[PDB]
Amino acid sequence: GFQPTNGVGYQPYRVVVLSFELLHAPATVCGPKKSTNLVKNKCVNFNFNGLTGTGVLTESNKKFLPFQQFGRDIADTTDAVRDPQTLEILDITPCSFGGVSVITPGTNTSNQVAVLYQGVNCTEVPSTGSNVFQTRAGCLIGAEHVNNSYECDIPIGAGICASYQSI
Amino acid sequence: TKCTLKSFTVEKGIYQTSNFRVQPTESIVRFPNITNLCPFGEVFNATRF
Amino acid sequence: QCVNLRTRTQLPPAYTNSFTRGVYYPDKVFRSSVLHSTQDLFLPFFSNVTWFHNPVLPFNDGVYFASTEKSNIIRGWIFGTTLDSKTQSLLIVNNATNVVIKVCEFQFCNDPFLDVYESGVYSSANNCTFEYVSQPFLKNLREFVFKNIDGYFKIYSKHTPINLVRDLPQGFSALEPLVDLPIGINITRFQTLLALHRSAAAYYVGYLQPRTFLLKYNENGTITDAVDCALDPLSE
Ligand SMILES: *[C@@H]1O[C@H](CO)[C@@H](O[C@@H]2O[C@H](CO)[C@@H](O)[C@H](O)[C@H]2NC(C)=O)[C@H](O)[C@H]1NC(C)=O
Numbered sequence: 001g002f003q004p005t006n007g008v009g010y011q012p013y014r015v016v017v018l019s020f021e022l023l024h025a026p027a028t029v030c031g032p033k034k035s036t037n038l039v040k041n042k043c044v045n046f047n048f049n050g051l052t053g054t055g056v057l058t059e060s061n062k063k064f065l066p067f068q069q070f071g072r073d074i075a076d077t078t079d080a081v082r083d084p085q086t087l088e089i090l091d092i093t094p095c096s097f098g099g100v101s102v103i104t105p106g107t108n109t110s111n112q113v114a115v116l117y118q119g120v121n122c123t124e125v126p127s128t129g130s131n132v133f134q135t136r137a138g139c140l141i142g143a144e145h146v147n148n149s150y151e152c153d154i155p156i157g158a159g160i161c162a163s164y165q166s167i
Numbered sequence: 168t169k170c171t172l173k174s175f176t177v178e179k180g181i182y183q184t185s186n187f188r189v190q191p192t193e194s195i196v197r198f199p200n201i202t203n204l205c206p207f208g209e210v211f212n213a214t215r216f
Numbered sequence: 217q218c219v220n221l222r223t224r225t226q227l228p229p230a231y232t233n234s235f236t237r238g239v240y241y242p243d244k245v246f247r248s249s250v251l252h253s254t255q256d257l258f259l260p261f262f263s264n265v266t267w268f269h270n271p272v273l274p275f276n277d278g279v280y281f282a283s284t285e286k287s288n289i290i291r292g293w294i295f296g297t298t299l300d301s302k303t304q305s306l307l308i309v310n311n312a313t314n315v316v317i318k319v320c321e322f323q324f325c326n327d328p329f330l331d332v333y334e335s336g337v338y339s340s341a342n343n344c345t346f347e348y349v350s351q352p353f354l355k356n357l358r359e360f361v362f363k364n365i366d367g368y369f370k371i372y373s374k375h376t377p378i379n380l381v382r383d384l385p386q387g388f389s390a391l392e393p394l395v396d397l398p399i400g401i402n403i404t405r406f407q408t409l410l411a412l413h414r415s416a417a418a419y420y421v422g423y424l425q426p427r428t429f430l431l432k433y434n435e436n437g438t439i440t441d442a443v444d445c446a447l448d449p450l451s452e
C-alpha cells in the first residue's frame with residue numbers, strides 16, 4: 001500500500017544482496033589494483049605485475065616480440081621488463097656494491113689513511129675527506145694524483161700504487 | 168683496521184676490512200590499466216526491481 | 217537442419233611423416249642468441265601423423281592439428297567427454313566476422329553441420345558459463361596446438377603460405393601463443409566441424425608426449441632451430 005504519506009515504516013525500500021563465490025574454477029572478478037608512478041636511474045625495488053626485485057631501471061633498446069612480458073639472460077636472471085601501461089622495454093641493473101680497503105703507511109710512521117672502494121664508480125660514494133681519484137680498480141679517497149713515477153710500495157692495482165712522502 | 172687485524176699496531180700495507188652496498192630509496196608498483204568494470208551501476212540505478 | 221549426409225565415406229586413415237613440425241614457444245620469456253633446454257609436451261620428430269581425407273577422436277594429453285586448406289571449409293571444434301547436456305562442453309566456431317567461443321551443455325546433432333540458410337549442430341543450449349568473441353582465426357597451411365592443464369586451455373597457432381601440393385613441408389617454424397582460457401573442464405575427446413553446402417576434407421592429426429628439447433633463440437628472440445633429445449645418439 002505504498003502512498004506518499006505512509007511514515008518511515010511503510011516506505012518502499014530497494015534491497016540488493018551480493019554473495020561472493022570462490023569455486024575451484026579460476027577467479028574472474030577482482031578489485032582494483034592501484035599502480036603507482038615510475039622512476040628511473042635510482043636504486044629502488046619493484047613488483048612489476050607481481051614480479052618482484054630490486055635494482056636500477058634504465059631505458060633499453062631491446063625489441064621484444066609482441067607477446068613477451070619480460071626477459072632474462074643466461075644463468076636465469078631477469079634483465080628486462082615491459083611496463084604494463086606504457087608498453088616500453090626497461091632494463092634492470094643490480095645496485096652497486098663492493099669491498100673497501102685501507103691504505104696505511106704503518107702506525108709506526110703516521111696514522112692517516114686512504115680508502116679504496118673496489119669496482120665502484122666515483123659517483124655514489126656516500127664522505128668527502130680530500131680530493132677523490134677514479135682508477136680502473138675503483139675509487140680512491142685521501143691521496144693526491146701525481147705525474148711522476150717510482151717503484152711500487154703498496155700495490156693498488158691496474159698498474160698504479162701508492163706511497164707516503166702525505167699519501 | 169685495528170679491530171679486524173686484532174692488534175694495536177698496524178704494519179704498512181693494504182687490508183680488506185668490510186663491504187659496501189647501496190640501499191634502495193623507495194618502492195615502485197606498476198600494473199596494467201584498470202578497465203572492464205563489473206556492471207553494478209545499471210542494476211543499482213535500475214528504475215524497476 | 218539436423219540432417220544426415222553420408223554413412224560410410226573413405227574409411228582407411230592414412231599415415232605420414234611429421235618431420236620437424238610442431239614447435240611452440242613454451243613461455244613468455246625473451247631470450248637472445250642462446251641455447252635453452254626444456255622439458256615439456258611436444259610432438260616427437262619424424263613421428264607418425266594420421267591423415268584424414270570424420271569420427272570422434274581421443275584427446276589424450278594434447279593435440280596438434282594441421283590443415284592444408286583453401287576457402288576455409290573447416291569451421292570450428294567441439295570438446296567434451298559425454299558430448300551432451302549432462303556434462304560441460306566447449307564449442308569454438310569461426311564465422312566471417314568474429315570467432316566465437318562458448319562453454320555450455322549442448323545436445324549436439326549426431327552429424328553436426330553448420331551450413332548456411334549459428335545453429336544446426338546443437339539441438340539445445342542451456343546453463344552457459346563462458347562466452348568469448350574475437351577476431352576470426354582464419355593454398356594455405358594452418359597449424360594449431362591445443363593443450364589443457366591446470367584448468368587452463370591453451371591454444372597456439374600459425375599460418376603459412378604453402379606452395380607444396382600434397383603433404384607437410386620440410387621446413388621449420390615456431391608457433392606463437394594465441395589464446396588462454398581459465399576454465400576448468402575434463403576434455404577427453406573432440407570432433408571437427410564443417411559447413412558444406414547441400415549438394416572429403418584433408419587434414420592431419422598428431423599427439424603430444426612429454427620429453428626434452430633443445431631450442432635456439434636468435435638475436436630477436438625467435439626460435440630458429442630445435443633438437444629432439446631422444447631421436448638418435450647424435451642428438452643425445
Ligand atoms: C592506459 O591508459 C592511459 C591513459 O589514457 C593511456 O595513456 C594514453 O594513451 C594514449 C593512446 O596512445 C596516448 O595518446 C596518450 O598520450 C596517453 N597518455 C599518457 C601516457 O599520459 C595508455 O596508453 C593506456 N595503456 C594501455 C591501454 O595499454
Ligand SMILES: *[C@@H]1O[C@H](CO)[C@@H](O[C@@H]2O[C@H](CO)[C@@H](O)[C@H](O)[C@H]2NC(C)=O)[C@H](O)[C@H]1NC(C)=O
Nearest residue numbers: 041119120121122123124134135136137138139
Ligand atoms: C660513472 O658514471 C658516469 C655517469 O654515467 C659516467 O659518465 C658517463 O660516461 C659515458 C661513457 O663514458 C658517457 O656516454 C656519459 O655521457 C657520461 N655521463 C656523465 C654524466 O658524465 C662515467 O663514465 C662512470 N665512470 C666510469 C669509470 O665509467
Ligand SMILES: *[C@@H]1O[C@H](CO)[C@@H](O[C@@H]2O[C@H](CO)[C@@H](O)[C@H](O)[C@H]2NC(C)=O)[C@H](O)[C@H]1NC(C)=O
Nearest residue numbers: 309310311312313314315316317334348349350
Ligand atoms: C558471426 O557470428 C556473430 C556471433 O555473435 C554473429 O553475431 C553478430 O556479430 C556482430 C559482430 O560485431 C554483432 O555486431 C552483432 O550484434 C551480433 N548479433 C547479435 C544478434 O548479437 C554474426 O551475426 C555472425 N555473422 C555472420 C555473417 O554469420
Ligand SMILES: *[C@@H]1O[C@H](CO)[C@@H](O[C@@H]2O[C@H](CO)[C@@H](O)[C@H](O)[C@H]2NC(C)=O)[C@H](O)[C@H]1NC(C)=O
Nearest residue numbers: 023025301303304319321342343344345346400
Ligand atoms: C551450470 O554449470 C555450472 C558450472 O559450469 C554448474 O556449477 C556447479 O556448481 C556446484 C555448486 O555450486 C558445484 O558443486 C559443481 O562442481 C559445479 N559444476 C561444474 C561443472 O563446475 C551448475 O551446476 C550447472 N547447472 C546446471 C543446471 O547444469
Ligand SMILES: *[C@@H]1O[C@H](CO)[C@@H](O[C@@H]2O[C@H](CO)[C@@H](O)[C@H](O)[C@H]2NC(C)=O)[C@H](O)[C@H]1NC(C)=O
Nearest residue numbers: 024025297304365366367368399400401402403
Ligand atoms: C574432472 O573429473 C574429476 C573426477 O574424476 C574431478 O575430480 C574431482 O575434483 C573434486 C574437486 O577437487 C574432488 O572433490 C573429487 O574428489 C575429484 N574426484 C576424483 C575422482 O579425483 C575434476 O574436478 C574434474 N575436472 C574439473 C576441471 O572439474
Ligand SMILES: *[C@@H]1O[C@H](CO)[C@@H](O[C@@H]2O[C@H](CO)[C@@H](O)[C@H](O)[C@H]2NC(C)=O)[C@H](O)[C@H]1NC(C)=O
Nearest residue numbers: 061062063064248433434435436437438439440
Ligand atoms: C632482427 O632484428 C634486426 C634489428 O631490427 C633486424 O635488422 C633490420 O632488418 C630490417 C629488415 O631487413 C632492415 O630494414 C633494417 O635495416 C635492419 N636493421 C639494421 C640495424 O641493420 C633483422 O632483420 C632481424 N632479423 C634477423 C634474422 O636478424
Ligand SMILES: *[C@@H]1O[C@H](CO)[C@@H](O)[C@H](O)[C@H]1NC(C)=O
Nearest residue numbers: 106107108109110175176177
Ligand atoms: C718506530 O719504529 C722504530 C724502529 O723501526 C722505533 O725506533 C720507534 O720507536 C718506533 N716509533 C713508534 C713505535 O712510535
Ligand SMILES: *[C@@H]1O[C@H](CO)[C@@H](O)[C@H](O)[C@H]1NC(C)=O
Nearest residue numbers: 131133143144145146147148
Ligand atoms: C700533471 O698533474 C696534474 C695534477 O694531477 C694534472 O692536472 C695534469 O694533467 C698532469 N699532466 C701535465 C702534463 O700537467
Ligand SMILES: *[C@@H]1O[C@H](CO)[C@@H](O)[C@H](O)[C@H]1NC(C)=O
Nearest residue numbers: 206207208209210211212213
Ligand atoms: C546512480 O545515479 C546517481 C545520479 O547522480 C549517482 O549519483 C549514483 O552514484 C549512481 N549509482 C550507481 C550505483 O550507479
Ligand SMILES: *[C@@H]1O[C@H](CO)[C@@H](O)[C@H](O)[C@H]1NC(C)=O
Nearest residue numbers: 231232233234262263264265
Ligand atoms: C606409420 O606406421 C605405418 C605402419 O603402421 C608405416 O607404414 C608408416 O610408414 C609410418 N609412417 C611414418 C613413420 O611416418
